[PDB]
Amino acid sequence: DDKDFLWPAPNEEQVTCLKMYFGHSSFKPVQWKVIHSVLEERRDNVAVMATGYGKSLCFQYPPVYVGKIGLVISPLISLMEDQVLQLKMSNIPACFLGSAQSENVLTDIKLGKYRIVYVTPEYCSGNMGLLQQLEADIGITLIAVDEAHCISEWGHDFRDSFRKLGSLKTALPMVPIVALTATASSSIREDIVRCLNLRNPQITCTGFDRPNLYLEVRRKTGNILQDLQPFLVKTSSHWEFEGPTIIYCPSRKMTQQVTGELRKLNLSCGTYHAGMSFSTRKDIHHRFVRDEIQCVIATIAFGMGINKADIRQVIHYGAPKDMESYYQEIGRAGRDGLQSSCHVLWAPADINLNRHLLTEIRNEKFRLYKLKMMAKMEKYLHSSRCRRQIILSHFEDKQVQKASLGIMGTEKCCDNCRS
């Protein structure tokens, strides 16, 4: 089941509701990440989706399941009308609220007859008083701002109508905003977060094929120089990686061991883990961005807010924590769009394939969740099937796989496609 790899597990009624109103059996990890964070954590989201495949469920499902109201702010008039119609046909009361439509629907919206109200930024700008009445009388499950990049003066498609959506978090400080956009740009994501006044927002990014990322899994010997010598070059009587490199290790001890071996080659490298100070980490982080140090030997702590476009190589030195961590970490490779490589150097020895520490966990559902993820992680590494297929099938909507067939079964896809 998909639900075996979701935390927390969707309850029977959440599944029932999904089948009845949307006609789906399962939530994809990103959808569930966004939906659960809206429902339980009431948490602001920036959800980047290259396309609209699986997009609508993220903002439509929560108000429908709680039976309250969801606001969808968008300038894409015709697509809002199409979704308003598909909702109506699914027995989900929905309307396009605008100045012309007001006389017809506004009383029914104030009375709580609608699950999902689509508005323009222009109309929402003029009616902050209304939304507060809906929050007071009904309770707003979420505000979805689509084409959220239009709030950025620095993007390709600016709209003055998005300026005033900065007020939403003043009018409705307890209501979560789900910002949606097709751009993976780090600076546009920064602009969206600032302009919409989002508070510690959840960042997801899906719909992308990432053809420039190559996937390989090889057995590690354990010996650190033998394992990593294939990744090094000899130039100017010294040693270095091909380009900017992150080596992710399962423990704080391994980051010290791996660095200590690369130190013996005078390789431009630096360590990052929890135990180090924030000044030395901000040095390591700033030296990486300015290309002063070529490698960062990292625990899971190094990752969020790197925003470095030209990471050429990610090495998992040891089996990843799980497919979730693995996905987040390799996704940091090749954000410039240029050819990068993602190699896992794994052994069954590795603590992240060691089932004993899950036989410790006395909380049954959480133990049995952790076992399934450790099992899913082993099944990926043990696989002789296409690695790109496994990761897209797990995390991405089934559309993304159709587009990525080109790269798949070719030299540049993965070790298993090279046959």
Q: Is 273 an interacting residue with respect to Zn ion (CB under 5 A)?
A: no
Using alpha carbons, select from 305, 289, 286, 288 the residue that is nearest to residue 297: 288
**Residues in contact with ligand A1CEW by the rule CB under 6 A:** 184, 203, 205, 208, 210, 213, 215, 303-305, 327-328, 330-332, 335, 337, 388, 391
- CA 320 – CA 329 distance, rounded (Å): 9
Consult the annotation and say whether 52 binds a ligand. Answer: yes
Q: Are 21 and 44 in contact (CB under 8 A)?
A: no
Q: Closest by alpha carbon to 143, among 100, 114, 172?
A: 172
Does 330 help bind Zn ion (rule: CB under 5 A)? no
Instruction: Collect all residues with Cβ–Cβ distance below 8 Å to 349 and sequence separation of at least 6.
Output: 222
Please tell me the distance from the alpha carbon of residue 316 to that of residue 299, in angstroms, as a whole number.
10
Nearest distance from C-beta of residue 388 to ligand A1CEW, angstroms: 4
Q: Tell me if residue 374 falls in helix, strand or coil.
A: helix
| 126 contact partners, CB below 8 Å, separation of at least 6 | none
- Measured from the CB atom, the residue of 88 and 418 that comes closer to Cl ion is 88
Piece of the chain touching Cl ion by CB under 5 A; list 84-92, 110-118, 187-195, 211-219? 84-92
Least CB distance to Cl ion at residue 115 (A):
12
CB of 389 to Zn ion, least distance (A): 6
- The site partner of 94 among Zn ion, ligand A1CEW, Cl ion, none (C-beta below 5 to 8 Å per kind) is none
Distance CA 293, CA 245 (A): 9
Q: What is the CA radius of gyration of the chain?
A: 24
Q: How far is CA 235 from the centre of its chain?
A: 38
> 3-class SS at 235?
strand
Q: Among residues 222 and 337, whose Cβ is nearest to ligand A1CEW? A: 337
Among 386, 390, 392, 400, binds Zn ion (CB under 5 A): 386
The one of Zn ion, Cl ion, ligand A1CEW, none whose footprint includes residue 304, by CB under 5 to 8 A per kind, is ligand A1CEW
What CA–CA distance (Å, rounded) separates 277 from 377? 32
Any known ligand binding at 31? yes
Select the residue interacting with Zn ion from 388, 390, 397, 400 (CB under 5 A).
388
Nearest distance from C-beta of residue 409 to ligand A1CEW, angstroms: 13
Taking the complex as a whole, how short is the minimal distance between the CB of residue 48 and ligand A1CEW, in angstroms? 7
**Rounded Cα distance, 2 and 29, in Å:** 8
58 labelled binding-site residue: no
Question: In the complex, what is the shortest distance from the CB of residue 387 to Zn ion, in angstroms, rounded to a whole number?
Answer: 6
386 binds, among ligand A1CEW, Zn ion, Cl ion, none (CB under 5 to 8 A by kind): Zn ion
> Using CB under 5 A, which of the segments 87-95, 297-305, 314-322, 333-341 binds Cl ion?
87-95
Residue 95 in marked binding region: no
Q: Does 91 bind Cl ion (CB under 5 A)?
A: yes
Long-range CB contacts for residues 169-173, cutoff 8 Å, separation at least 24: 169/196, 169/197, 169/198, 169/199, 170/197, 171/128, 171/131, 171/132, 172/131, 172/132, 172/135, 172/140, 172/143
Q: Are 315 and 247 in contact (CB under 8 A)?
A: yes
Q: Which stretch binds Zn ion (CB under 5 A): 119-127, 155-163, 244-252, 411-419?
A: 411-419
Contacts of 111 (CB under 8 A, 6+ apart): none
Q: Which stretch binds Zn ion (CB under 5 A): 24-32, 280-288, 346-354, 409-417?
A: 409-417
Which residues contact Zn ion (rule: CB under 5 A)? 386, 388, 413-414, 417
Residue numbers in the known binding site for Zn(2+) are 386, 413-414, 417
Query: Residues forming the annotated binding site for ATP?
Result: 24, 26, 28, 31, 52
Interface residues with Cl ion (CB under 5 A)?
Answer: 91
